[PDB]
């Protein structure tokens, strides 16, 4: 009667992963994919009552990714490799926009939940958890959708976690504080999968019994509205609590009011 | 000099806190109670080369873990590890005597007074405010050579790794560079 | 309900407090109607209207409570006023009690039924919200010009001696406890302090706009059961209604 | 006439038959008739706000041991108050808190004016064992309460609440007085008696601009302040208000990194207890100064110490999503899939947004305008 809906975000943007090859190293786009879909079946073989669910951002959209092995499984990973080959082959450059559409994939992810929550018969409880890997650089100009998505996430208690690989977000950090989730920064990227294995495997009431890395210090920086880019000290309106960088005789936001 | 001595005999912490900012010549008593009182095209050709090599992928099993990986972030993640690093000030309770821990807290409380005086007096408006910052600057460092010197000898003869020096040197150093920048704005503004 | 009349009988000993002429110097009915108006003080706030039978009565009562250490806590919750018959001395006493009422303070204002300023005033609301009749009140029978009159209505009138002097009683006790509602929105607390109102021939002389309205329930109920019905009263009282 | 006089109301007559089977169709209308039951808005009321310095004066006297509510009036009044500080602190971001005793025809500051809830419970959990003695002072509590909010900025809402048990005070000198003072001052008092109706309280609340009530129960004293908690209405634009905050990040230290640096919290040197020095936790971003609760005020540079979640929290009522236009699914030419959730579109109806064209199913929909607060297709 334990039902456990895991849901994988994966940052598909295709500059980092293009610089990544360029760079031939050691890990690429093919084994972060294989590495989600070993967690995803894992985590159905857990139990046979878990669900998985795959969306994976892209400049352009999100899109939903989902012979001696399991069936089911088999279908699965040809269904998630045809998407994510799909999704490449026609991911075309139209615009200057390079920043990933984090905060779209997670709308989706949340409304997917819900909506898998009605269809959930009422003697068992839909217990989900989103975990979103992060390869490109975060980005600012989200930042008031993205806090509320977080919001939206806390109140109906849905853990999100963050595994970041290359650079650190703020956002993803507090995400992970505000809903309770992990946070984790991955010091070997081909290892990556066994941490999948290690630590976001086990589910909540399973994270109690085992033991897990403290949170990392998790900043707390705002974005002003004028700018879009964080901040420490800035100037704060007492009516609306818009942000500001700089003194104003009169507030935008207050004048736009009326 | 009656109400003085009984304010000070009143508060044992605050004629401690005298004796070490009076006695030691650190500030003046008419001070000390008036304050009481984005690239080239290289981006478009890494997109294309990814492109190309994603269109013809195939699953792998073998390549996507190894034994030794494993075993190291086993080890990683295991108690003591990097990301597992037990310390975390294991005996911090216990280290750094209590002894040292009331001067710790003295010189905490007198440095934040002192910086409380500073951030009252900024910004400097008025030029007699000017002279006034001055001030509290010469009391800081005569402060820190008291105290923070003595004391930073006493850790090294007693060898202790825990850096309560570090946060009383971050805020003394934040505190001189506002100073000298406020300075060099105001050089500026006359120029 | 604007009013909430009743009658209390015997008091927290169990003994009666009524206003008998005998029992005028009985320590134990004094020590009750001191002890009545000591939790009635703190009740009911920004003025308590209490009449007495006479002012021989009412002098011997405030002496006892003086001589006791009772009168004191009254003083501290309310202020107590003495009216007089003088006329220059009670219009003061009045003029210091409105404004003792206008705010928080609070006051007491003492007098006698049968006085000027029984009727000379009208307690309007938040003025005089508790109204207390200490005993019956009973016009003196000497001076032989009652009786004479009682004599003249006996053989002419066929007019009974004992409910004449019940009528008139009971009429002026009315009348001064009638002064506490004026207007709709007025409301107020009435109380007698006697056991004799409990007895039907003296509730048939009450007006039927308060018959009504005095529940058999509390007719003689003590001092402390009284001190609840006046809290519930006036705590279910406060709220805002509609016209 | 009556209503209930006339005809007798037939509500089964709605349900009717064509096709022999058709009935099911119309509970499916009824289950369409099923969702959509709210506004689309969580409150619906004010949709904006303003800093409140909020004083509230709790009665000492002898009437406080009355056994009205249960144990005492003091202990429910001080839980209750416990219960009204956390809701106002969780709605309130940037409000400040004040309590007053008054006791003994006096009055004493018990807590400084401050945004932390902790020390506010702390100091009402130690006021619970005091003694009830003496008489209030309503005339000391408003003079104390005028001193301090007089230096307070105009644009900040100025509120007071006095909690009166005992229906007497005392007053050194005339209260009307005071009363035209704080009219002219710009303060608002509130009063929520305990006994009955008092005179000089009506005529304060009326004259002030505040509001008097009377505790019928428990129940009525919970239901009135959250009724307090509750910020007043603000004009669209009053003046420059603005003031500089810092935004603390919780920077944690690990020993395996050369920056361990130990601290004492500046809240928790004047603690009784040893302070804990842990490994790290909000420093200052002007002076440095730890500390380990927010929103706390910085004791050191005066600088204002904000959580951005807690600010971010309230910026959906800013800029509220517009509803959706109900179209119907056999008037729409397009995809039959939500753009949400991925899920066939079989309803009647199909909600399509005025900015990105985008479909969303009726689940999806009210997810977005009751939860979400944002469009997704918006986002992209
Ligand atoms: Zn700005
Ligand atoms: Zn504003
Ligand atoms: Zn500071
Ligand atoms: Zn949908
Ligand atoms: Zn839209």
């Given at each position: 009667?334990?039902?456990?809906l895991?849901?994988?975000?994966?940052?598909?943007?295709?500059?980092?992963?293009?610089?990544?090859?360029?760079?031939?190293?050691?890990?690429?786009?093919?084994?972060?994919?294989?590495?989600?879909?070993?967690?995803?079946?894992?985590?159905?073989?857990?139990?046979?009552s878990?669900?998985?669910?795959?969306?994976?951002?892209?400049?352009?959209?999100?899109?939903?990714?989902?012979?001696?092995?399991?069936?089911?499984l088999?279908?699965?990973?040809?269904?998630?490799?045809?998407?994510?080959?799909?999704?490449?082959?026609?991911?075309?450059?139209?615009?200057?926009?390079?920043?990933?559409?984090?905060?779209?994939?997670?709308?989706?992810?949340?409304?997917?939940?819900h909506?898998?929550?009605?269809?959930?018969?009422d003697?068992?409880?839909?217990k989900?958890?989103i975990?979103?890997?992060?390869?490109?650089?975060?980005?600012?100009?989200?930042?008031?959708?993205?806090?509320?998505?977080?919001?939206?996430?806390?109140?109906?208690?849905?853990?999100?976690?963050?595994?970041?690989?290359?650079s650190?977000?703020?956002?993803?950090?507090?995400?992970?504080?505000?809903?309770?989730?992990?946070?984790?920064?991955?010091?070997?990227?081909?290892?990556?999968?066994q941490?999948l294995?290690?630590?976001?495997?086990?589910?909540?009431?399973?994270?109690?019994?085992?033991?897990?890395?403290?949170?990392?210090?998790?900043?707390?920086?705002?974005?002003?509205?004028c700018?879009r880019?964080?901040?420490?000290?800035?100037?704060?309106?007492?009516?609306?609590?818009?942000?500001?960088?700089?003194?104003?005789?009169?507030?935008?936001?207050?004048?736009?009011?009326? | 000099?009656?109400?003085?001595?009984?304010m000070?005999?009143?508060?044992?912490?605050?004629?401690?806190?005298?004796?070490?900012?009076?006695?030691?010549?650190?500030?003046?008593?008419?001070e000390?109670?008036?304050?009481?009182?984005?690239?080239?095209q290289?981006?478009?050709?890494?997109?294309?080369?990814?492109?190309?090599?994603?269109?013809?992928?195939?699953?792998?099993?073998?390549?996507?873990?190894?034994?030794?990986?494993?075993?190291?972030?086993?080890?990683?993640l295991?108690?003591?590890?990097?990301?597992?690093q037990?310390?975390?000030?294991?005996?911090?309770?216990?280290?750094?005597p209590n002894?040292?821990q009331?001067?710790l807290?003295?010189?905490?409380?007198?440095?934040?007074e002192?910086l409380?005086?500073?951030?009252?007096?900024?910004?400097?408006?008025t030029?007699?405010?000017?002279?006034?910052?001055?001030?509290?600057?010469?009391?800081?460092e005569?402060?820190?050579?008291?105290?923070?010197?003595?004391?930073?000898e006493?850790?090294?003869?007693?060898?202790?790794?825990?850096?309560?020096?570090?946060?009383?040197?971050?805020?003394?150093?934040?505190?001189?560079?506002?100073?000298?920048?406020?300075?060099?704005?105001?050089?500026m503004?006359?120029? | 309900?604007?009013?909430?009349?009743?009658?209390?009988?015997?008091?927290?000993?169990?003994?009666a407090?009524?206003?008998?002429?005998?029992?005028?110097?009985?320590?134990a009915?004094?020590?009750?109607?001191?002890?009545?108006?000591?939790?009635?003080?703190?009740?009911?706030?920004?003025?308590?209207?209490?009449?007495?039978?006479?002012?021989?009565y009412?002098?011997?009562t405030?002496?006892?409570?003086?001589?006791?250490?009772?009168?004191?806590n009254?003083?501290?919750?309310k202020?107590?006023?003495?009216?007089?018959?003088?006329?220059?001395?009670?219009?003061?006493?009045?003029?210091?009690?409105?404004?003792?009422?206008?705010?928080?303070?609070?006051?007491?204002?003492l007098?006698?039924?049968?006085?000027?300023?029984?009727?000379?005033?009208?307690?309007?609301?938040?003025y005089?919200?508790?109204?207390?009749?200490?005993?019956?009140?009973?016009?003196?029978?000497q001076?032989?010009?009652?009786?004479?009159?009682?004599?003249?209505?006996?053989?002419?009138?066929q007019?009974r001696?004992?409910?004449?002097?019940?009528?008139?009683?009971?009429r002026?006790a009315?009348?001064?406890?009638?002064?506490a509602?004026?207007?709709?929105?007025?409301?107020?607390?009435?109380?007698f302090?006697?056991?004799?109102?409990?007895?039907?021939?003296?509730?048939?002389?009450?007006?039927?706009?308060?018959?009504?309205?005095?529940?058999?329930?509390?007719?003689?109920?003590?001092?402390?059961?009284?001190?609840?019905?006046?809290?519930?009263?006036?705590?279910?009282?406060?709220?805002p209604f509609?016209? | 006439?009556?209503r209930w006089?006339?005809?007798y109301?037939?509500?089964?007559?709605?349900?009717?038959?064509?096709?022999?089977?058709?009935?099911?169709?119309?509970?499916?209308?009824?289950?369409?008739?099923?969702?959509?039951?709210?506004?689309?808005?969580?409150?619906?009321?004010?949709?904006?706000?303003?800093?409140?310095?909020?004083?509230?004066?709790?009665?000492?006297?002898?009437?406080?041991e009355?056994?009205?509510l249960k144990?005492?009036?003091?202990?429910?009044?001080?839980?209750?108050?416990?219960?009204?500080?956390?809701?106002?602190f969780?709605?309130?971001?940037?409000?400040?808190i004040?309590?007053?005793?008054?006791?003994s025809?006096?009055?004493?500051?018990?807590?400084?004016?401050?945004?932390?809830?902790?020390?506010?419970?702390?100091?009402?959990?130690?006021a619970?064992?005091?003694?009830?003695?003496?008489?209030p002072?309503?005339?000391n509590?408003?003079?104390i309460?005028?001193?301090?909010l007089?230096?307070?900025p105009?644009?900040?809402?100025?509120?007071?609440?006095?909690?009166?048990?005992?229906?007497?005070?005392?007053?050194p000198?005339?209260?009307?007085?005071?009363?035209?003072?704080?009219k002219?001052?710009?303060?608002?008092?509130?009063?929520?008696?305990?006994?009955?109706?008092?005179?000089?309280?009506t005529?304060?609340?009326?004259e002030?601009?505040?509001?008097?009530?009377?505790?019928?129960?428990?129940?009525?004293?919970?239901?009135?302040?959250?009724?307090?908690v509750?910020?007043?209405?603000?004009?669209?634009?009053?003046?420059?208000?603005?003031?500089?905050?810092?935004?603390?990040?919780?920077?944690?230290?690990?020993?395996?990194?050369?920056?361990?640096?130990?601290?004492?919290?500046?809240?928790?040197?004047?603690?009784?207890?040893?302070?804990?020095?842990?490994?790290?936790?909000?420093?200052?971003?002007?002076?440095?100064?730890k500390?380990?609760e927010?929103?706390?005020?910085?004791?050191?540079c005066?600088?204002?110490?904000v959580?951005?979640?807690?600010?971010?929290?309230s910026?959906?009522?800013?800029?509220?999503?517009?509803?959706?236009?109900?179209?119907?699914?056999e008037?729409?030419?397009?995809?039959?899939?939500?753009?949400?959730?991925?899920?066939?579109?079989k309803?009647?109806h199909?909600?399509?947004?005025?900015?990105?064209?985008?479909?969303?199913?009726?689940?999806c929909?009210?997810?977005?305008?009751?939860s979400?607060?944002?469009?997704?297709?918006?986002?992209?």
């Amino acid at each position: 009667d334990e039902l456990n809906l895991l849901v994988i975000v994966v940052d598909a943007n295709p500059i980092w992963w293009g610089k990544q090859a360029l760079k031939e190293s050691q890990f690429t786009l093919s084994k972060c994919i294989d590495a989600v879909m070993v967690l995803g079946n894992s985590h159905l073989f857990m139990n046979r009552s878990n669900k998985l669910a795959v969306i994976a951002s892209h400049i352009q959209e999100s899109r939903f990714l989902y012979d001696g092995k399991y069936e089911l499984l088999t279908s699965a990973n040809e269904v998630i490799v045809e998407e994510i080959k799909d999704l490449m082959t026609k991911s075309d450059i139209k615009g200057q926009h390079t920043e990933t559409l984090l905060a779209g994939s997670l709308a989706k992810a949340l409304c997917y939940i819900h909506r898998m929550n009605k269809e959930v018969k009422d003697n068992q409880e839909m217990k989900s958890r989103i975990l979103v890997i992060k390869a490109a650089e975060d980005s600012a100009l989200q930042y008031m959708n993205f806090m509320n998505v977080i919001f939206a996430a806390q109140k109906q208690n849905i853990l999100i976690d963050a595994c970041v690989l290359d650079s650190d977000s703020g956002l993803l950090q507090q995400a992970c504080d505000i809903t309770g989730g992990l946070y984790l920064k991955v010091p070997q990227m081909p290892s990556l999968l066994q941490y999948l294995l290690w630590v976001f495997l086990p589910d909540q009431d399973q994270r109690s019994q085992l033991i897990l890395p403290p949170p990392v210090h998790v900043d707390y920086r705002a974005a002003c509205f004028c700018h879009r880019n964080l901040i420490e000290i800035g100037y704060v309106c007492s009516v609306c609590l818009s942000i500001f960088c700089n003194f104003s005789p009169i507030c935008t936001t207050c004048e736009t009011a009326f | 000099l009656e109400e003085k001595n009984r304010m000070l005999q009143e508060d044992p912490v605050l004629f401690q806190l005298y004796k070490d900012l009076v006695v030691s010549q650190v500030i003046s008593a008419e001070e000390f109670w008036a304050n009481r009182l984005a690239t080239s095209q290289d981006i478009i050709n890494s997109f294309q080369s990814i492109r190309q090599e994603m269109e013809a992928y195939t699953p792998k099993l073998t390549q996507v873990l190894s034994s030794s990986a494993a075993s190291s972030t086993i080890t990683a993640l295991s108690p003591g590890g990097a990301l597992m690093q037990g310390g975390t000030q294991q005996a911090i309770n216990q280290m750094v005597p209590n002894d040292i821990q009331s001067e710790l807290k003295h010189l905490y409380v007198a440095v934040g007074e002192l910086l409380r005086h500073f951030w009252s007096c900024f910004p400097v408006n008025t030029p007699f405010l000017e002279e006034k910052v001055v001030k509290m600057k010469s009391n800081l460092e005569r402060f820190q050579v008291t105290k923070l010197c003595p004391f930073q000898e006493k850790i090294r003869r007693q060898y202790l790794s825990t850096n309560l020096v570090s946060h009383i040197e971050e805020m003394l150093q934040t505190a001189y560079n506002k100073l000298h920048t406020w300075q060099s704005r105001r050089l500026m503004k006359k120029t | 309900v604007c009013l909430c009349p009743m009658i209390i009988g015997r008091g927290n000993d169990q003994v009666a407090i009524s206003s008998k002429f005998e029992t005028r110097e009985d320590i134990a009915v004094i020590r009750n109607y001191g002890n009545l108006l000591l939790e009635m003080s703190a009740v009911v706030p920004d003025g308590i209207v209490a009449f007495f039978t006479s002012y021989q009565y009412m002098e011997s009562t405030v002496a006892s409570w003086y001589e006791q250490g009772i009168l004191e806590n009254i003083q501290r919750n309310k202020l107590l006023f003495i009216e007089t018959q003088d006329g220059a001395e009670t219009s003061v006493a009045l003029e210091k009690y409105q404004e003792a009422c206008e705010n928080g303070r609070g006051a007491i204002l003492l007098s006698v039924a049968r006085g000027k300023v029984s009727e000379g005033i009208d307690f309007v609301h938040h003025y005089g919200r508790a109204v207390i009749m200490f005993g019956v009140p009973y016009v003196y029978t000497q001076s032989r010009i009652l009786k004479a009159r009682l004599e003249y209505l006996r053989d002419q009138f066929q007019i009974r001696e004992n409910d004449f002097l019940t009528f008139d009683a009971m009429r002026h006790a009315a009348q001064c406890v009638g002064r506490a509602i004026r207007g709709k929105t007025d409301y107020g607390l009435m109380v007698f302090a006697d056991k004799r109102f409990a007895r039907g021939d003296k509730r048939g002389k009450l007006p039927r706009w308060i018959q009504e309205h005095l529940t058999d329930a509390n007719l003689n109920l003590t001092v402390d059961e009284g001190v609840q019905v006046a809290k519930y009263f006036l705590r279910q009282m406060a709220q805002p209604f509609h016209r | 006439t009556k209503r209930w006089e006339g005809g007798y109301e037939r509500t089964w007559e709605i349900l009717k038959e064509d096709e022999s089977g058709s009935l099911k169709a119309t509970i499916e209308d009824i289950l369409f008739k099923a969702k959509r039951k709210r506004v689309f808005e969580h409150h619906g009321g004010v949709r904006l706000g303003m800093m409140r310095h909020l004083y509230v004066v709790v009665d000492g006297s002898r009437t406080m041991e009355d056994q009205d509510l249960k144990p005492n009036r003091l202990t429910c009044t001080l839980k209750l108050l416990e219960y009204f500080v956390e809701e106002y602190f969780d709605q309130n971001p940037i409000s400040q808190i004040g309590i007053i005793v008054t006791k003994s025809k006096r009055a004493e500051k018990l807590t400084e004016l401050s945004g932390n809830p902790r020390k506010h419970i702390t100091s009402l959990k130690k006021a619970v064992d005091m003694t009830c003695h003496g008489e209030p002072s309503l005339y000391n509590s408003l003079s104390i309460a005028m001193q301090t909010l007089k230096h307070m900025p105009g644009h900040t809402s100025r509120e007071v609440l006095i909690i009166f048990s005992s229906l007497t005070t005392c007053d050194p000198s005339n209260i009307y007085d005071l009363i035209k003072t704080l009219k002219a001052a710009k303060i608002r008092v509130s009063v929520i008696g305990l006994s009955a109706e008092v005179r000089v309280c009506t005529v304060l609340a009326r004259e002030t601009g505040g509001t008097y009530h009377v505790i019928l129960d428990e129940s009525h004293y919970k239901e009135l302040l959250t009724h307090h908690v509750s910020p007043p209405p603000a004009s669209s634009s009053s003046e420059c208000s603005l003031i500089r905050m810092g935004f603390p990040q919780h920077t944690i230290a690990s020993l395996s990194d050369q920056d361990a640096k130990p601290s004492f919290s500046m809240a928790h040197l004047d603690g009784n207890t040893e302070p804990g020095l842990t490994l790290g936790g909000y420093f200052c971003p002007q002076c440095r100064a730890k500390y380990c609760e927010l929103p706390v005020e910085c004791k050191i540079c005066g600088l204002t110490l904000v959580s951005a979640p807690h600010l971010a929290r309230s910026y959906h009522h800013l800029f509220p999503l517009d509803a959706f236009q109900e179209i119907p699914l056999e008037e729409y030419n397009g995809e039959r899939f939500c753009y949400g959730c991925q899920g066939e579109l079989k309803d009647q109806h199909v909600y399509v947004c005025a900015v990105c064209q985008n479909v969303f199913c009726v689940d999806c929909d009210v997810f977005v305008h009751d939860s979400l607060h944002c469009c997704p297709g918006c986002i992209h």
